[PDB]
Amino acid sequence: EVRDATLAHKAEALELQRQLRRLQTQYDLLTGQSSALIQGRRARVAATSAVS
Amino acid sequence: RMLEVSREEAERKRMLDERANYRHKQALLEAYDQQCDEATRIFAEYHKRL
């Protein structure tokens, strides 16, 4: 009866931490992996101008 | 933090797949140079004066 007054906030509680851990695996983990191929673009077009 | 840009991928197809068969173009360049060569062929012994 009264736990519904309290279990209600539990649903949103697990919602934001589930976001937060989804956020947590993406704060400093995006820059760790999304820049893996950034190094290529320096030489990925140097050879393009080389055939000219 | 969307700092990935797949333009490298667009150039990954471009960067060095040309060299993996670098000699396809030289066969055609031989064909383009063939008219230069065949003109040189016909300008060899008597047309050497040309």
From Swiss-Prot, chain A:
<comment type="similarity">
    <text>Belongs to the HAUS3 family.</text>
</comment>
<feature type="coiled-coil region">
    <location>
        <begin position="4"/>
        <end position="37"/>
    </location>
</feature>
<comment type="subunit">
    <text>Part of the augmin complex composed of 8 subunits. The complex acts on microtubules and interacts with gamma-tubulin in spindles and the phragmoplast. Interacts with AUG1.</text>
</comment>
<protein>
    <recommendedName>
        <fullName>AUGMIN subunit 3</fullName>
    </recommendedName>
</protein>
<comment type="function">
    <text>Involved in microtubules reorganization during spindle and phragmoplast development. Required for gamma-tubulin localization during mitosis.</text>
</comment>
From Swiss-Prot, chain B:
<comment type="similarity">
    <text>Belongs to the HAUS5 family.</text>
</comment>
<protein>
    <recommendedName>
        <fullName>AUGMIN subunit 5</fullName>
    </recommendedName>
</protein>
<comment type="function">
    <text>Involved in microtubules reorganization during spindle and phragmoplast development.</text>
</comment>
<comment type="subunit">
    <text>Part of the augmin complex composed of 8 subunits. The complex acts on microtubules and interacts with gamma-tubulin in spindles and the phragmoplast.</text>
</comment>
